[PDB]
Antibody, heavy 215, light 211 residues
Framework: QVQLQQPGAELVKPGASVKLSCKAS????????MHWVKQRPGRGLEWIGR????????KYNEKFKSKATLTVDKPSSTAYMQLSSLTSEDSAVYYC?????????????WGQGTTLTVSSAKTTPPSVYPLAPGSSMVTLGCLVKGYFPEPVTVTWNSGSLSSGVHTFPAVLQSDLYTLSSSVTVPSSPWPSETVTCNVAHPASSTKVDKKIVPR | QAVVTQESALTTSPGETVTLTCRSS?????????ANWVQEKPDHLFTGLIG???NRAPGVPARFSGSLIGDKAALTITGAQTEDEAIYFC?????????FGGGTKLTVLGQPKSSPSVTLFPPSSEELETNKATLVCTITDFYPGVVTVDWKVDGTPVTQGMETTQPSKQSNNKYMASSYLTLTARAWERHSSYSCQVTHEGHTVEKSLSR
């Protein structure tokens, strides 16, 4: 029952710092080294550095030498990593991993990574725009652009339409997210029968309905 | 100051034997590089498989073994299973730091290959009223889950302006992804032919719009 616990997400403003935690349980903190890794989704993993929990001794990736600081709190069995002078670009998943240093040399157990999002934006409601084609089954879609924070819920015909619905992952585009959703309806329903997409955005308490009409 | 290289994607069938490799840009990989193999399943789920070249982490099936083949570290899956479909990353030690490879996306055919369904939408008009234009290219139901999306404005490969999400697993176990090409109301009105080209398990699909 080896476990490395990391908080799931963290929101910070640019120029500040964050102290990410990694609580270890089910093993003797001490017999293992703790490593930190950066995962930019769409790029590999980049090793940040390690810490020995016994002496507190660290080794860094020269690249991070000035962006990260590793620390340990032996008593509470937790590794920490501070990231300073944050900017949009530090957004990514940061994992903590254990390394069997005195034994077989593997990074056996990993924490679930903390998603760090660095952004200057404030709750910002989406701008839903309708995606009708240009030219049997037809695909319609909705663009939910420049909203913040995450998430938004997209529904077609208020739920009636649940088959052939694809809702894509959002992308952080200038401190703001963008996401789109599509539904494939037979060619007979549309445009005969109205297709309407519904976007709900909690943080900002918005609900927008947008009908997909040809154009 | 060393670059670990791995195959980009590999496709196999349940029951086969498949080998992934890990190459170092500085020289042959040796036992002092302590090759590690890590697996990433969906949901940011990491587990260690092998360490110190050939030590299998405890509770990792025996179908997994590591070794050095030639001048590189290798991971062999003997009797690949459907469950092994994931991203495998290798890590190499270099006297003072670790360098991770780019990872290999491995697909263990659990259903027949399926071509993507691509659709390109034009910037809507309410959006052209913002002095902005975004062409959305949606790609769904493809398997294996790996694609290449290339945009071409007026015959010319756009190279800036595009963003492509990472393949996400749908319910049926096929994947999806969308790519965005953001222009300005103006860039929009300038050029005349837009096209979203999707490359999947060797066939290409081009969906073009005409303004």
């Amino acid at each position: 029952q080896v476990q490395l616990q990391q908080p799931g997400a963290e929101l910070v403003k640019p120029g500040a710092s964050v102290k990410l935690s990694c609580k270890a349980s089910g093993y003797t903190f001490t017999s293992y080294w703790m490593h930190w890794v950066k995962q930019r989704p769409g790029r590999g993993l980049e090793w940040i550095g390690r810490i020995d929990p016994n002496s507190g001794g660290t080794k860094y990736n020269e690249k991070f030498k000035s962006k990260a600081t590793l620390t340990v709190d032996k008593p509470s069995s937790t590794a920490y990593m501070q990231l300073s002078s944050l900017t949009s670009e530090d957004s990514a998943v940061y994992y903590c991993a254990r390394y069997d240093y005195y034994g077989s040399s593997y990074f056996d157990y990993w924490g679930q990574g903390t998603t760090l999002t660095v952004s200057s934006a404030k709750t910002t409601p989406p701008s839903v725009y309708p995606l009708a084609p240009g030219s049997s089954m037809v695909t319609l879609g909705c663009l939910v652009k420049g909203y913040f924070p995450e998430p938004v819920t997209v529904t077609w015909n208020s739920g009636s339409l649940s088959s052939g619905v694809h809702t894509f992952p959002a992308v952080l585009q200038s401190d703001l997210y963008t996401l789109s959703s599509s539904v494939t309806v037979p060619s007979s329903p549309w445009p005969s029968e109205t297709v309407t997409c519904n976007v709900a955005h909690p943080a900002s308490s918005t609900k927008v309905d947008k009908k997909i009409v040809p154009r | 100051q060393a670059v670990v290289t791995q195959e980009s994607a590999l496709t196999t069938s349940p029951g086969e034997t498949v080998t992934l490799t890990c190459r170092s840009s500085t020289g042959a990989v040796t036992t002092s590089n302590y090759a590690n193999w890590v697996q990433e399943k969906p949901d940011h789920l990491f587990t260690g498989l092998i360490g110190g070249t050939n030590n299998r982490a405890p509770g990792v099936p025996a179908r997994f073994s590591g070794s050095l083949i030639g001048d590189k570290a290798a991971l062999t899956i003997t009797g690949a299973q459907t469950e092994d479909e994931a991203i495998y990353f290798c890590a190499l030690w270099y006297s003072n730091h670790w360098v991770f490879g780019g990872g290999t996306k491995l697909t263990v055919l659990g259903q027949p290959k399926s071509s993507p369904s691509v659709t390109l939408f034009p910037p809507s008009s309410e959006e052209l009223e913002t002095n902005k234009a975004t062409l959305v290219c949606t790609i769904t139901d493809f398997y294996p889950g790996v694609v290449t999306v290339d945009w071409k404005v007026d015959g010319t490969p756009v190279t800036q302006g595009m963003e492509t999400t990472q393949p996400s697993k749908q319910s049926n176990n096929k994947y999806m992804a969308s790519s965005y090409l953001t222009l300005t109301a103006r860039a929009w009105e300038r050029h005349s032919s837009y096209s979203c080209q999707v490359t999947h398990e060797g066939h290409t699909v081009e969906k073009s719009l005409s303004r």
